[PDB]
Description:
It is found in: Host cytoplasmic vesicle membrane. The chain is about 40% helix and about 15% strand.
Amino acid sequence: GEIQWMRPSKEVGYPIINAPSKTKLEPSAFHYVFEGVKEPAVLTKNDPRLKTDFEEAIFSKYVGNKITEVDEYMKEAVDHYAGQLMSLDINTEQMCLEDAMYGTDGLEALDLSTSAGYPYVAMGKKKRDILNKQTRDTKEMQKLLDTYGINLPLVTYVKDELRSKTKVEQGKSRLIEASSLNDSVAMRMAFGNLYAAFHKNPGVITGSAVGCDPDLFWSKIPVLMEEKLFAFDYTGYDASLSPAWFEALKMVLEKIGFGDRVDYIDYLNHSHRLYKNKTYCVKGGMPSGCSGTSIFNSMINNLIIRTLLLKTYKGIDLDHLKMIAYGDDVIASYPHEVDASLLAQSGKDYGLTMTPADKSATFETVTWENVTFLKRFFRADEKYPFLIHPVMPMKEIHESIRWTKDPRNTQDHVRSLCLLAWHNGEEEYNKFLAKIRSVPIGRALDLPEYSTLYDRWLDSF
């Protein structure tokens, strides 16, 4: 990904975009009861905590485009992976406007909270106005698609979330690039069926984990995986993707019966976007807040791994590659051991920064005892070994609970955390509930006891 040019929006007929200058995150009732070193991300150029220019910091994720064309290795990766998706019988038909808008089996209805995008964000028009759950009306949207068309600029927002002390001081705040409602709708109509297929089939056939339920999915993973596991982390995956990877993605889509609408991928790839008073054009790099982003990143990750395997290890049998990706996150396996370090260097050739899995200083053997996926460890149940617990470290949970966006969401926010926490064992969980109940707010909450969660989990398979 690389910025081609940037400049004042007024010079090209675009209006300035107001972005919430204040963070919605504030110390929660549990701020001093649990330990955390995280603070709200930097949102404006003026934040006193900065130690380097804010504008440069946020855009520096656009490293450039290391590759131009789609080489032989990528092509075979495309063939192999396209070959697998082919077996799912993915409905190639387009999805109707109604389903694309209000959900259907396999696809949730448009999220009514996230940005409406341009020009709606500049008109003052919000989502709850364009649609509604009960009546499932499309007349309004239909009228708006005809009015402002598609392929509209993305609106770039600084993501309001928790970041480490360093990330704050270096202004390393992440960006959400909001897709226009129209684009969102169109893309959903175009690939709705593809998304549904993916959500209903997390595993080694889609090579995707998007939409999965970790409580249940964990127990299936090891079975699906080959003998020797391998993994690594990416640095700025989304922004590092070169146009060539999008081309490969288009090739896959084309091979699975989506040829007629690969144009949407160009839009993700080579787009035009708005940030405050500035307008800029980007070549390469996957925009975060667009329709299919997770799925497309995952598909690309499938092509990436294959490509590196093919280039690093001629003769490799991809039919024996068992991987599951969730965007840039990935768990992979092969019957034979592979050198992650060696793969990381082949990666650098395709504009990919690959480092040891889970910030280890050096590349080491990945085992079931140390591997993580979606920040979660894998731990067989002490009583029912065949059932695997997804284990989110308590540190993450403590960090999260120390803050709040909406005091009314406290109940759900804590409840959610518990559903994650209990997998750390009864003793750990009780200490957690104990701490929660050491403040009035926490005592007022309605939380599940350990035995409840455990029994429900056991019964769920």
